[PDB]
């Protein structure tokens, strides 16, 4: 199958050329909303933690797949293990607000506490990369405060991605990347 | 990704017609920079076709003719085009159209294949693909850029966070 490469129009040749037969595909596991819905760990800070999806490590499955889209939208679910009373604050609210029990506050109930949070940012859709290294302060879901927070998790809901970006793998030194695979 | 860290392979004049040769895996060093091998690291298994795109960059007065071939596992891959001619292969040459597209079949015993390459695997399980230069008119020092993208039936499943 020959064509003009400079066209950039996608050209997918198939096995039927030399006499194969194309099989059936089931792509559920690569679906954006499916693959990004799960918890990913973020190293917390003792008291105040601004909820931000860019704090996830870049090499994690949720971190990497997030960063491959310039423009992303989703709700948020958090799972927190903390002491005291976990207080949440909406986007753009003053830091002095986190000390008010009137704001949403989850009294400590062991082992941990799970919340579901709406998309609170003013911008129609958020961004992983911004041209203006820093990202604007308006990108965040708000912050949470507690006497101390031991663990923090993010789970995206209804994820939507736009304008894909490079996704890199580990570069082997030898001809292949050889890892020890689970075996009995 | 090729030697010298350039995304192309240059025509060569010598008894050696092997232009580039590499494992078929999504953990290969050559694939490492692609977007396709970018998603792979977050999934354990895949199936389906992986397409390769070739675009000849040389001047209008230079002509070459190439061979791409698939060497299935179980035997050493071919070192000469005459040896490879028995495999599944395609052959094309330069002309008005600058680009060629070749679909590498998914051919395996099990319906799915691991993305990662196990350390106890000495020889690739999915075999090799080999790119040869049949001949070239006046093509010395002319570049062939190559690209890779998913096919129609390419399917990828079982997400996992491997670090990386």
């Amino acid at each position, epitope marked *: 199958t020959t064509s003009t490469g400079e066209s950039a129009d996608p050209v997918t040749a198939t096995v039927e050329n030399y006499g194969g037969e194309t099989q059936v595909q089931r792509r559920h596991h690569t679906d954006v909303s499916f693959i990004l819905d799960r918890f990913v760990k973020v190293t917390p800070k003792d008291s105040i933690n601004v909820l931000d999806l860019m704090q996830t490590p870049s090499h994690t499955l949720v971190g990497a797949l997030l960063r491959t889209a310039t423009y992303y939208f989703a709700d948020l679910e958090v799972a927190v293990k903390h002491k005291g009373d976990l207080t949440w604050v909406p986007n753009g609210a003053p830091v002095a607000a986190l000390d008010n029990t009137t704001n949403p506050t989850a009294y400590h109930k062991a082992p941990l506490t799970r919340l579901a949070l709406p998309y609170t940012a003013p911008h129609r859709v958020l961004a992983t990369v911004y041209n203006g290294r820093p990202l604007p302060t308006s990108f965040n879901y708000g912050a949470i405060k507690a006497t101390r927070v031991t663990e923090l998790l993010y789970r995206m809901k209804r994820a939507e991605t736009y304008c894909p970006r490079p996704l890199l793998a580990v570069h*082997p*030194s*030898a*001809a*292949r990347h*050889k890892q020890k695979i689970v075996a009995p | 990704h*090729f*030697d010298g860290d350039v995304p192309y392979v240059t025509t*060569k004049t*010598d*008894s*050696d017609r*092997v232009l*580039a*040769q*590499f*494992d078929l895996s999504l953990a*290969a*060093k*050559h694939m490492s920079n692609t977007f396709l091998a970018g998603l792979a690291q977050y999934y354990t298994q895949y199936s389906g076709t992986v397409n390769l795109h070739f675009m000849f960059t040389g001047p209008t007065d230079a002509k070459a003719r190439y061979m791409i071939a698939y060497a299935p596992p179980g035997m*050493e*891959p071919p*070192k000469t085009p005459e040896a490879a001619a028995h495999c599944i292969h395609a052959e094309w040459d330069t002309g008005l159209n600058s680009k060629f597209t070749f679909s590498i079949p998914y051919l395996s015993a099990a319906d799915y294949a691991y993305t990662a390459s196990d350390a106890a695997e*000495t*020889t690739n399980v999915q075999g*090799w693909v080999c790119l040869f230069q049949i001949t070239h008119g006046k093509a010395e020092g002319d570049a062939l850029v190559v690209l890779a993208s998913a096919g129609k039936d390419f399917e990828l499943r079982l997400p996992v966070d491997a670090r990386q």
Partner: nanobody, 117 residues
Framework: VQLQESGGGLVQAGGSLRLSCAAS????????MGWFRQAPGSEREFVAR????????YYADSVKGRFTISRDNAKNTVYLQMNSLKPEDTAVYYC???????????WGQGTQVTVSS
């Protein structure tokens, strides 16, 4: 299929060594051959390559021009001639076989080389 390095030892700066690697178990003239080096405490880095035909080679930049790789298909062996040795070059040198542009798989045990100054 097993490889065995040899020719290592000790030397002082400006010296030279010739490493030797023997292959066994299958056709040696069908494989590309290359060397890796792991300096202690650094991760292991690439060195040099030789195609089965002996025609084509490639050299790591730091070793470019100082070292010369050569294989003997008759003798079922490959050689790395190290020249103008430098205290940085201290490392274990692994002999590698393989198909791919980098030779990769089928590693020997590697030999020890320490250049002193």
């Amino acid at each position: 299929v097993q490889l065995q390095e040899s020719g290592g030892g000790l030397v002082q700066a400006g010296g030279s060594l010739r490493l030797s690697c023997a292959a066994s178990g299958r056709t040696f003239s069908s494989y590309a051959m290359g060397w890796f080096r792991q300096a202690p405490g650094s991760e292991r880095e690439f060195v040099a390559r030789i195609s089965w035909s002996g025609g084509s080679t490639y050299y790591a930049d730091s070793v470019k021009g100082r070292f010369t790789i050569s294989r003997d298909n008759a003798k079922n062996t490959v050689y790395l001639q190290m020249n103008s040795l430098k205290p940085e070059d201290t490392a274990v040198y692994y002999c590698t076989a393989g198909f791919a542009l980098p030779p990769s798989d089928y590693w020997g045990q590697g030999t020890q080389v320490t250049v002193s100054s």
